[PDB]
RNA sequence: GUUUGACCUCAAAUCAGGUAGGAGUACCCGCUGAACUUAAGCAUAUCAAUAAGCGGAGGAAAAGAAACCAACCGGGAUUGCCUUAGUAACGGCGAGUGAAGCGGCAAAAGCUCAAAUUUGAAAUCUGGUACCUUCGGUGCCCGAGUUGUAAUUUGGAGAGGG
RNA sequence: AUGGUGAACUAUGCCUGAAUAGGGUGAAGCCAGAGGAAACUCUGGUGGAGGCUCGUAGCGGUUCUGACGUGCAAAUCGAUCGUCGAAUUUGGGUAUAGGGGCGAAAGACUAAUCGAACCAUCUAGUAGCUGGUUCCUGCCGAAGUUUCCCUCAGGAUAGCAG
RNA sequence: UUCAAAUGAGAACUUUGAAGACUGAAGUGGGGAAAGGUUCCACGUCAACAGCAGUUGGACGUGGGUUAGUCGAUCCUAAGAGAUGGGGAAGCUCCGUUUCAAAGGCCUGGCAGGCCACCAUCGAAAGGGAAUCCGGUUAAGAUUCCGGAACCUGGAUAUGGAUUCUUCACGGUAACGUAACUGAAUGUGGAGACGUCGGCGCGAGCCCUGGGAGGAGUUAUCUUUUCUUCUUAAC
RNA sequence: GCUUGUGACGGCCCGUGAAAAUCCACAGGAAGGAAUAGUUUUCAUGCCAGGUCGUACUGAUAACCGCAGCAGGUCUCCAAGGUGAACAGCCUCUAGUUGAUAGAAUAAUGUAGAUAAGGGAAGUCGGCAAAAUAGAUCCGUAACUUCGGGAUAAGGAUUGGCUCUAAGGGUCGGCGAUCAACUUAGAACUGGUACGGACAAGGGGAAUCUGACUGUCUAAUUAAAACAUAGCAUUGCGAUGGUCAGAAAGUGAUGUUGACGCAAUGUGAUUUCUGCCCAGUGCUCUGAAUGUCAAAGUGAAGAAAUUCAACCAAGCGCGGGUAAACGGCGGGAGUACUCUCUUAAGGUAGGGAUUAACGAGAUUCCCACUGUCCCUAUCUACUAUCUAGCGAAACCACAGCCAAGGGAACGGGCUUGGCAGAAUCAGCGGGGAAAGACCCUGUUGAGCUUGACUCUAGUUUGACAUUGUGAAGAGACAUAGAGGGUGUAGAAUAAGUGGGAGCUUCGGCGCCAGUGAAAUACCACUACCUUUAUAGUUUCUUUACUUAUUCAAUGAAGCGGAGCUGGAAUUCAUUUUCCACGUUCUAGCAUUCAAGGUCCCAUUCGGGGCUGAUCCGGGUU
RNA sequence: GUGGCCCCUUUAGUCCCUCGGAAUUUGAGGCUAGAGGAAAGUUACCACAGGGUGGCUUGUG
RNA sequence: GCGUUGGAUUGUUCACCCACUAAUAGGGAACGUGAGCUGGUAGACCGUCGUGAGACAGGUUAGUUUUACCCUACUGAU
């Protein structure tokens, strides 16, 4: 057992954690080996080329260093002397080579730094300066295109480790000195217009969901992301402000100008035609759900919808369900009359099908629930024609419009539809 | 189910040691005024064999100071002592092989055997064949002494605790293969009834946790816990790891 | 006076004299404690505060003269019978379980210590011994005992002084 | 379930004693001679090792369309076979006791009893289903989805008769 | 398996004799341990039993018979069992065997001074162990009785012998020797006291064998022949 | 020569192969003893006594156990001659027995044996069984091999009797005289059908699968590829301990132990091979904070019972390790899918695989050999058979000739027909005798297993009590305070909201002026954030003491402190520390209140005290 | 013409009843009226108790 | 009416192969549950599955019923 003890680390560390005044020489016997090992790492199937590897076999030097790193990181607190430069050695092993290290060794160092920060050996203010620069470097597109670069796994590890760090730091009280510092790097990433704000948006969404970053300073970051030029950043911002919306709307600085800038930049202004329909629809949803909720006025929305309000168009049931969400009690009903007369011309016309007509009437009555004086009695009557329609979609739809105007403006309806209380209320109030 | 073999081992019917032919319990001299202040001389008469044990013993005759008589102690012989040799035991004894000293008196780097965990234990450590402990350092204040044991562990104990210089005799005993069931038979005939060992996989479920099955296998994970109890602890009690090293 | 004694505590004797054990155990006083069964199968539950097991007595044992029942115009130790009553109550509110006061009767019985200064008299008691009228008495001598033996007092009362 | 009796068979350990023809092979060590500068080699002998071997007693129990089959025998007889100096065979003494022991492990052995020994009591234990249920005569005299409790199911009911 | 005779009411089975065979010294012999318990031996003796029989029997009825200082137990301890003291347990009882006891036995000269240190008991008729052999005798008993000849233990002791006036012996260079030749406490050493196999040597008994002194047998022919006795215990 | 005892030697061991009673001797020298006489009972002789119980007989085909006068089982000693290697088998001596129901015949079928022409496995599931071989001398002996074996490999020549030759030894004599045993080799002659003349006594070979081997088990159907084994690997444990017991205990096993050990597992000789995964399940980590979070304890409300809140150990959760742990079998990247390329379970070589021995293990083929077969026949012994004597059992509704029909596919009985003569012996096995598995079901009995349900020993962590004497620190309740805000633009660091255009020390300024979602003076509201102090309130961490408590040891022996005493030692003036007058060439010895010195008495043949050997202490260490 | 063609949870009681020695106030139980809706496998190692042709066919799709 | 064979093959045979022969025809009386004699549960191993105890899509190996002396029938004998 004695001759094998230097080979068995798991027993050595349990012995050292008991009586660490002893086992000094046993620790130096391994620190010297670790030093000599790091001083090294610092510096195909074709008939011709050398044969390749499977991706899971490693070197005996690396297999030893991966063990020694854990041993030293777990007994550094017992030996503060002879280990003061150890975490700095790890840090400059990582952020000066990035490439001459195998993935297992990188992962091991990344976990040992995290536990060395859980213990108060290392501070977050100097672990952040190790973790963040590796994200940008392994999202390079030139580092991630080796043979067996583990770039995606490393980018996931560093991200979840940052999350654990900030979750650690914001437990008792919110470390404002840290949050205010690592929001500045998100701001200074979103400036770089290529794609690097991905690691700001993807992180701020996580921290909002974990409730760690409920602050006005953070919603500005996602506003700037939504106002960005890159599609996968704009979408991150839009899906953040969606998730029916979340409480972040109640920490905005100017929602009306936000919606105006969005509608001007992305959809209408240059007509760059970058977003696909699946993303344009998600932008429409955000705009309409902000507008209806906060009583906004843009008036370009209501002509932008009209191109897409045709039953021969791709997935219109989402578009028309957002059309209603941008209606108010406080907008000129003529610009909605044109919309209702487009829908009526193209969905409840002659020959149209049952689903088409029912969709039209259902998306008109939920408009009129917000903007009641946006369609007049003459077309209201044309649509309550379809009460007894034998199809069971159009009947259920027309009954909703009738019950909507039975409580709001029952004089537009005819005597046949005023249902026993609207008529009685009108008979007393007409004299 | 049944009660199993390791549980039966504790009662001690047929598993008691076989102690007829043992020459006697091997021990150091009792801690007395002579050993505490100066030394005392004895003569080693016989180097002898002990049944059930691989190391040889030494009969050492000392003179009783308080009464006119002789007293024979049974020491475990170290490698190099001989009959007619004089064994000096105590604090002021010289630094030679076979002599008994306290660990505080000797320097660091020396080799000793039959060490006492505490003074008055009369021999606890480094008693088997070819075994020794190494003193690495002293701390005279707070009097303690740091030693390395055969397993590689490092311990700190009283400097007044005693030990006998040298290595226990009989080394290399396990380098020879036995080649035969009969030599193991005769070996354990004199130790105890821990041989032969049937495998739990080869039994029925009543007789072992590992028993049962149409194929000889274990149904699970031979690493048992440490909080397990009395019938569950089949193999690999509290394994920190497994596998070849 | 580094001596001579008193007390306290703990021991020893084939010391003087006595005492316990074990048996039987139908009934009696306690302790300990199952399952079969019945419930649908079954954890509660029932069988059962049973059987087996242990300790301990007598001709009876135990209980017993209220820290009771009551709510009456008040009764008045304990035990057992008739009745209260298959009731009040308990319970997967299921199987099932389950008392008590009152009333009539049998038999009838009441009492004792500690806690109080004899303080003008430890007045008390075992043992040893000599006689005697020997289930015991008188005298005498060692001893117990004041860290309390006698008389007097026990709540129904009672004591002291007059 | 409760409380008790068993290691005289047999399993295992320990203590103390006893028993085991004749042959075959021929290991280390050793002697001489020959060839060598010498390491060393070759030849002839000696010696008598081995959980070697043939094979008695002994221990076991492979095969036979074997004998017997209410047999000598509740496991035997014959021939044939495995082993035969050792992890050998064995006597007496001793230890381990029942949900326990022992086990070179077959759920084997533990007094012809073992996937939980034997004895007595609780105990007339109990389901389910089977079997049986003791004299004569006279008078009357049936029945098979009709309705349901978590489907079988043991049932509860309509109708029939006295 | 057979033949004759005897016995008897009766004989395939009993007794004697005459034959023929068997076990064949790892026995169908002579003795013992465990177990059994009179089955041993004698005298009567046949109702039942001995798978036929029966005058016979380990049967039935009645008696006789087992002699120890030396053989054994008894004693010692082995694996182990088990009280006390103490501690548990409601308790029947459990633990453990020198433990946390004031655990008792010797001296010197109103008892005074000293010395020693230590655990009940049980446990082997094959382990250890003090000492007996021969011959004869019984219906049946014997290393036990008779005769003769010895030995061990323990005890009291007289005589002779040895030693001594150089008080507790001499000789021998030595290994050591002798008829003896004082010895308390205390201590030490030895014996008791030890495996198994191989071959070599020595001894006892047996086997084989010669001469001679005796007895028996064969002898149709031969064989100075075949068999048998000629022994010597403990001490 | 056989048996036995004994001696000196040799070999084997990770095996080194009882204890006590009892006896003796030695060292030592307390002591006592002769002179006009003692001493010695380990020299010789002489005297006395030796208790209790057992003691016969069998010890087995009749005295024991098996229900018995049962072919079974049951420990041991002695052990003759011949053949022959031999305690084998065969015959015999001594000793013992001649017991087992008998007689007459000689049918079949059987049981136990034996022989058979020619052919020789055509038999049969299958060469089952039987036959053949067999001892000793000589020649000769392959592949393979862990170099030790295989191997009696295989395959061949012989064996009698009689008469001879040669060689192989001991004791005495300055080469001979004398004595004696069975061992081998060789020759001649001779009889033969046969010569290990009976008994006794291997059949062999080419290959496959399998387990390394020797060994062990299912007593009473399974002896094996099962178990064990050596070897191999892993795990836990440094005694305050690991594993395991006990109701408890001042209790126990391993342990008369100590990592070359104990305990727990798996694999299963040697050789060769041995690549990767910690996603999962388990195991493990002296693993931060936060989350979950029992009891006690704390705070608030209430008149109180109570109610609420906060705090809240381990464990879980969380994230690190481990695959000779159970599992398991690929990796990475770009935009679950889809494209891409690495796949290091690569043979290191084209010498990569030609691979032991052992086995009552499973299998095929060949030689030899035969009545297995064509194709059966014959003989011997014991039965059967007959006789004298003795004398059961199973089974039994009643009984016993067939056919057809009905019929539960199926009558001995009923209907219709065929028929039908006493009483019987030996055989046979068609039927009847006439006495099985398999399938299903119980809301069954037990055994076993598992994150099935309810529990539980044990273990673990927390509170209280046992529990006393001291000290120093950190956090929080609770009040009193004190200040704060950078996304961008804007003079500037804008919580936010609402009132609005000066109280004025200055008119600095507030309004009017940009820029901004929001506009600043002045005064109020009520959100967050961070800090200051401790009336008190508490909680927690660390540390000191010993008398409780706990552990261990011993002969309860030498402990603690001392101008101690005496030495040095280095000091800055006086100490502080070491030592102590006690012991180290050697297989010796060390004991009689300890000799000596010194004080006293008595003069005795000797006594006592101090010291030799420092003092003190209410702690055995 | 008095519409239309087919059982365990919770709340509330003026001056509801009771809490049995009397009362008051909290709680509790009633009677009313409302609003809601314990438990898996295996056994060949096993054991017990029970149970179990319509004259049918033929050579030709 | 009378005959309708001998053999090879078990990595198998609900059969086929070559010979002899005059020929080498088919079937029943059992297989309309189950009935002479002979091949084709308990132990152990590999494979699939199962958390496991164990089970099976399998495969291999080893593995104790024992009349007639009764009635009838049949065969022979008084």
Short mmCIF file of C-alpha atoms in Angstrom, two decimals, chain A residues 42-309:
data_model
loop_
_atom_site.label_atom_id
_atom_site.label_comp_id
_atom_site.label_asym_id
_atom_site.label_seq_id
_atom_site.Cartn_x
_atom_site.Cartn_y
_atom_site.Cartn_z
CA UNK A 42 3.11 25.53 -21.82
CA UNK A 43 5.50 24.74 -24.69
CA UNK A 44 -6.35 10.01 -41.44
CA UNK A 45 -7.27 6.64 -42.93
CA UNK A 46 -5.53 7.44 -46.21
CA UNK A 47 -2.58 5.37 -47.38
CA UNK A 48 -0.25 8.35 -46.75
CA UNK A 49 -1.25 10.22 -43.61
CA UNK A 50 -0.85 9.26 -39.97
CA UNK A 51 -3.78 7.38 -38.46
CA UNK A 52 -6.28 9.40 -36.44
CA UNK A 53 -7.77 8.93 -33.00
CA UNK A 54 -11.23 8.07 -31.71
CA UNK A 55 -11.62 11.15 -29.48
CA UNK A 56 -11.67 9.50 -26.03
CA UNK A 57 -8.13 8.12 -25.59
CA UNK A 58 -5.66 10.44 -23.88
CA UNK A 59 -1.99 10.72 -22.91
CA UNK A 60 -0.49 9.43 -19.67
CA UNK A 61 0.90 12.91 -18.97
CA UNK A 62 -2.54 14.48 -19.33
CA UNK A 63 -4.16 11.72 -17.28
CA UNK A 64 -1.72 12.57 -14.47
CA UNK A 65 -2.13 16.34 -14.71
CA UNK A 66 -5.92 16.00 -14.62
CA UNK A 67 -5.57 14.16 -11.30
CA UNK A 68 -2.93 16.44 -9.79
CA UNK A 69 -4.97 19.55 -10.58
CA UNK A 70 -7.88 18.23 -8.54
CA UNK A 71 -5.63 17.14 -5.67
CA UNK A 72 -3.91 20.52 -5.48
CA UNK A 73 -7.17 22.46 -5.85
CA UNK A 74 -8.68 20.46 -2.97
CA UNK A 75 -5.68 20.81 -0.61
CA UNK A 76 -4.62 24.38 -1.44
CA UNK A 77 -6.63 25.61 1.55
CA UNK A 78 -4.61 23.28 3.79
CA UNK A 79 -1.32 24.35 2.13
CA UNK A 80 -1.73 28.10 1.51
CA UNK A 81 2.03 28.29 1.14
CA UNK A 82 3.40 26.55 -1.97
CA UNK A 83 0.01 27.11 -3.71
CA UNK A 84 -0.40 30.90 -3.83
CA UNK A 85 0.50 31.05 -7.54
CA UNK A 86 -1.45 27.88 -8.44
CA UNK A 87 -4.70 29.59 -9.60
CA UNK A 88 -2.69 32.16 -11.57
CA UNK A 89 -0.83 29.28 -13.21
CA UNK A 90 -4.22 27.82 -14.17
CA UNK A 91 -5.47 31.17 -15.48
CA UNK A 92 -2.43 31.82 -17.69
CA UNK A 93 -2.50 28.19 -18.77
CA UNK A 94 -5.99 28.84 -20.11
CA UNK A 95 -6.04 32.35 -21.54
CA UNK A 96 -2.62 32.35 -23.26
CA UNK A 97 -2.78 29.06 -25.21
CA UNK A 98 -6.47 28.02 -25.58
CA UNK A 99 -5.43 25.28 -28.03
CA UNK A 100 -2.41 23.22 -26.89
CA UNK A 101 -4.53 21.78 -24.04
CA UNK A 102 -6.89 18.80 -24.42
CA UNK A 103 -10.57 19.26 -23.71
CA UNK A 104 -10.53 17.08 -20.59
CA UNK A 105 -7.78 19.21 -19.03
CA UNK A 106 -9.64 22.40 -19.96
CA UNK A 107 -12.85 21.07 -18.37
CA UNK A 108 -10.97 20.01 -15.24
CA UNK A 109 -9.36 23.44 -14.84
CA UNK A 110 -12.71 25.14 -15.44
CA UNK A 111 -14.31 23.11 -12.65
CA UNK A 112 -11.36 23.57 -10.29
CA UNK A 113 -11.57 27.34 -10.74
CA UNK A 114 -15.28 27.18 -9.93
CA UNK A 115 -14.72 25.28 -6.69
CA UNK A 116 -11.73 27.53 -5.87
CA UNK A 117 -14.21 30.42 -6.16
CA UNK A 118 -16.87 28.61 -4.12
CA UNK A 119 -14.18 28.52 -1.49
CA UNK A 120 -12.98 32.10 -1.13
CA UNK A 121 -9.51 31.48 -2.58
CA UNK A 122 -10.39 33.22 -5.87
CA UNK A 123 -12.73 36.17 -6.39
CA UNK A 124 -15.46 36.55 -9.01
CA UNK A 125 -13.88 39.80 -10.21
CA UNK A 126 -10.88 37.81 -11.52
CA UNK A 127 -12.76 34.64 -12.49
CA UNK A 128 -14.98 36.66 -14.84
CA UNK A 129 -11.86 37.90 -16.66
CA UNK A 130 -10.98 34.21 -17.23
CA UNK A 131 -14.41 32.95 -18.27
CA UNK A 132 -15.74 35.67 -20.59
CA UNK A 133 -12.74 35.90 -23.01
CA UNK A 134 -13.03 32.17 -23.78
CA UNK A 135 -16.64 32.46 -24.96
CA UNK A 136 -15.73 34.95 -27.70
CA UNK A 137 -12.71 32.81 -28.62
CA UNK A 138 -14.60 29.51 -28.97
CA UNK A 139 -17.44 31.25 -30.82
CA UNK A 140 -14.74 32.29 -33.36
CA UNK A 141 -15.74 30.08 -36.31
CA UNK A 142 -11.98 29.43 -36.73
CA UNK A 143 -11.40 27.77 -33.38
CA UNK A 144 -14.60 25.71 -33.73
CA UNK A 145 -13.49 24.20 -37.09
CA UNK A 146 -10.60 22.01 -36.06
CA UNK A 147 -10.87 18.24 -36.11
CA UNK A 148 -11.81 17.54 -32.47
CA UNK A 149 -12.28 20.98 -30.99
CA UNK A 150 -14.90 20.69 -28.24
CA UNK A 151 -15.99 24.28 -28.80
CA UNK A 152 -19.74 23.84 -28.27
CA UNK A 153 -19.22 21.87 -25.05
CA UNK A 154 -16.75 24.44 -23.75
CA UNK A 155 -19.13 27.29 -24.61
CA UNK A 156 -21.86 25.48 -22.68
CA UNK A 157 -19.60 24.78 -19.69
CA UNK A 158 -18.39 28.37 -19.38
CA UNK A 159 -21.96 29.66 -19.71
CA UNK A 160 -23.43 27.42 -17.01
CA UNK A 161 -20.42 28.18 -14.79
CA UNK A 162 -21.01 31.94 -15.12
CA UNK A 163 -24.65 31.31 -14.22
CA UNK A 164 -23.64 29.32 -11.14
CA UNK A 165 -21.22 32.10 -10.18
CA UNK A 166 -23.82 34.86 -10.30
CA UNK A 167 -26.43 32.66 -8.62
CA UNK A 168 -23.81 32.10 -5.87
CA UNK A 169 -23.13 35.80 -5.54
CA UNK A 170 -26.77 36.98 -5.46
CA UNK A 171 -27.98 34.59 -2.74
CA UNK A 172 -27.81 36.61 0.50
CA UNK A 173 -27.68 40.09 -1.05
CA UNK A 174 -27.37 41.22 -4.66
CA UNK A 175 -23.73 41.98 -5.41
CA UNK A 176 -24.38 45.21 -7.30
CA UNK A 177 -20.63 45.70 -7.79
CA UNK A 178 -20.62 42.45 -9.81
CA UNK A 179 -23.94 42.75 -11.66
CA UNK A 180 -23.24 46.33 -12.74
CA UNK A 181 -19.81 45.21 -13.96
CA UNK A 182 -20.98 42.17 -15.95
CA UNK A 183 -23.84 44.11 -17.53
CA UNK A 184 -21.26 46.50 -18.98
CA UNK A 185 -19.67 43.60 -20.86
CA UNK A 186 -23.09 42.72 -22.30
CA UNK A 187 -23.42 46.32 -23.48
CA UNK A 188 -19.88 46.23 -24.92
CA UNK A 189 -20.65 42.93 -26.65
CA UNK A 190 -23.85 44.15 -28.30
CA UNK A 191 -21.80 46.98 -29.95
CA UNK A 192 -19.70 44.46 -31.82
CA UNK A 193 -22.16 43.99 -34.69
CA UNK A 194 -21.14 40.52 -35.97
CA UNK A 195 -22.88 38.13 -33.59
CA UNK A 196 -21.19 38.43 -30.19
CA UNK A 197 -24.24 39.76 -28.32
CA UNK A 198 -25.67 36.24 -28.44
CA UNK A 199 -23.80 35.54 -25.20
CA UNK A 200 -25.37 38.64 -23.63
CA UNK A 201 -28.97 37.92 -24.65
CA UNK A 202 -28.86 34.17 -23.92
CA UNK A 203 -27.43 34.99 -20.47
CA UNK A 204 -29.71 37.88 -19.51
CA UNK A 205 -32.77 35.79 -20.38
CA UNK A 206 -31.54 33.04 -18.06
CA UNK A 207 -30.86 35.46 -15.22
CA UNK A 208 -34.25 37.13 -15.64
CA UNK A 209 -35.89 33.70 -15.51
CA UNK A 210 -33.94 32.86 -12.35
CA UNK A 211 -35.00 36.23 -10.92
CA UNK A 212 -31.43 37.40 -10.32
CA UNK A 213 -31.45 40.43 -12.66
CA UNK A 214 -34.81 42.14 -12.07
CA UNK A 215 -33.59 45.64 -12.85
CA UNK A 216 -34.25 48.52 -15.23
CA UNK A 217 -30.64 48.42 -16.45
CA UNK A 218 -31.11 44.95 -17.95
CA UNK A 219 -34.25 45.58 -20.01
CA UNK A 220 -32.29 48.27 -21.86
CA UNK A 221 -29.86 45.56 -23.02
CA UNK A 222 -32.64 43.53 -24.61
CA UNK A 223 -34.17 46.69 -26.06
CA UNK A 224 -30.84 47.38 -27.78
CA UNK A 225 -30.78 43.75 -28.90
CA UNK A 226 -34.25 44.04 -30.44
CA UNK A 227 -33.05 47.24 -32.15
CA UNK A 228 -29.96 45.41 -33.49
CA UNK A 229 -29.14 44.39 -37.08
CA UNK A 230 -28.38 40.71 -36.44
CA UNK A 231 -31.39 38.45 -36.77
CA UNK A 232 -30.58 35.96 -34.00
CA UNK A 233 -30.02 38.87 -31.58
CA UNK A 234 -33.18 40.74 -32.57
CA UNK A 235 -35.10 37.50 -32.10
CA UNK A 236 -33.58 36.93 -28.67
CA UNK A 237 -34.77 40.40 -27.66
CA UNK A 238 -38.25 39.89 -29.10
CA UNK A 239 -38.70 36.48 -27.48
CA UNK A 240 -37.51 37.99 -24.20
CA UNK A 241 -40.13 40.72 -24.31
CA UNK A 242 -42.75 38.10 -25.21
CA UNK A 243 -41.63 35.51 -22.64
CA UNK A 244 -49.44 37.69 -23.10
CA UNK A 245 -46.25 39.55 -22.18
CA UNK A 246 -44.02 39.71 -19.08
CA UNK A 247 -43.44 42.31 -16.37
CA UNK A 248 -40.40 43.75 -18.19
CA UNK A 249 -42.79 46.03 -20.12
CA UNK A 250 -43.41 47.83 -16.80
CA UNK A 251 -39.69 48.74 -16.61
CA UNK A 252 -39.39 50.29 -20.09
CA UNK A 253 -38.36 53.90 -20.64
CA UNK A 254 -40.52 54.63 -23.69
CA UNK A 255 -42.67 51.88 -25.11
CA UNK A 256 -44.25 54.08 -27.78
CA UNK A 257 -40.90 55.15 -29.22
CA UNK A 258 -39.72 51.55 -28.91
CA UNK A 259 -42.61 50.26 -31.04
CA UNK A 260 -42.16 53.14 -33.49
CA UNK A 261 -38.45 52.40 -33.93
CA UNK A 262 -39.16 48.68 -34.36
CA UNK A 263 -41.85 49.19 -37.01
CA UNK A 264 -39.65 51.72 -38.80
CA UNK A 265 -36.38 49.77 -38.75
CA UNK A 266 -37.32 46.15 -39.33
CA UNK A 267 -40.60 45.83 -41.23
CA UNK A 268 -41.19 48.98 -43.28
CA UNK A 269 -38.20 51.32 -43.52
CA UNK A 270 -35.65 49.84 -45.92
CA UNK A 271 -37.61 46.68 -46.90
CA UNK A 272 -34.34 44.80 -46.67
CA UNK A 273 -36.36 41.54 -46.57
CA UNK A 274 -34.10 39.74 -44.09
CA UNK A 275 -36.64 38.22 -41.71
CA UNK A 276 -38.64 35.20 -42.84
CA UNK A 277 -42.38 34.97 -42.22
CA UNK A 278 -41.96 33.00 -38.98
CA UNK A 279 -39.96 35.92 -37.54
CA UNK A 280 -42.09 38.69 -39.04
CA UNK A 281 -45.10 37.15 -37.30
CA UNK A 282 -43.29 37.17 -33.96
CA UNK A 283 -42.43 40.84 -34.49
CA UNK A 284 -46.08 41.61 -35.30
CA UNK A 285 -47.19 39.83 -32.12
CA UNK A 286 -44.89 41.96 -29.97
CA UNK A 287 -45.94 45.22 -31.64
CA UNK A 288 -49.66 44.54 -31.35
CA UNK A 289 -49.47 43.25 -27.78
CA UNK A 290 -47.54 46.34 -26.67
CA UNK A 291 -49.92 48.62 -28.56
CA UNK A 292 -53.20 47.22 -27.24
CA UNK A 293 -51.86 47.09 -23.69
CA UNK A 294 -50.37 50.60 -23.49
CA UNK A 295 -52.68 52.63 -25.79
CA UNK A 296 -50.20 53.43 -28.56
CA UNK A 297 -50.71 55.13 -31.93
CA UNK A 298 -48.62 54.35 -35.03
CA UNK A 299 -51.21 54.17 -37.87
CA UNK A 300 -48.82 52.40 -40.28
CA UNK A 301 -49.50 49.00 -38.69
CA UNK A 302 -53.02 49.04 -40.02
CA UNK A 303 -51.94 49.33 -43.67
CA UNK A 304 -48.99 46.97 -43.22
CA UNK A 305 -51.42 44.24 -42.15
CA UNK A 306 -53.53 44.60 -45.29
CA UNK A 307 -50.97 43.06 -47.65
CA UNK A 308 -50.92 39.95 -45.45
CA UNK A 309 -54.69 39.81 -44.81
#
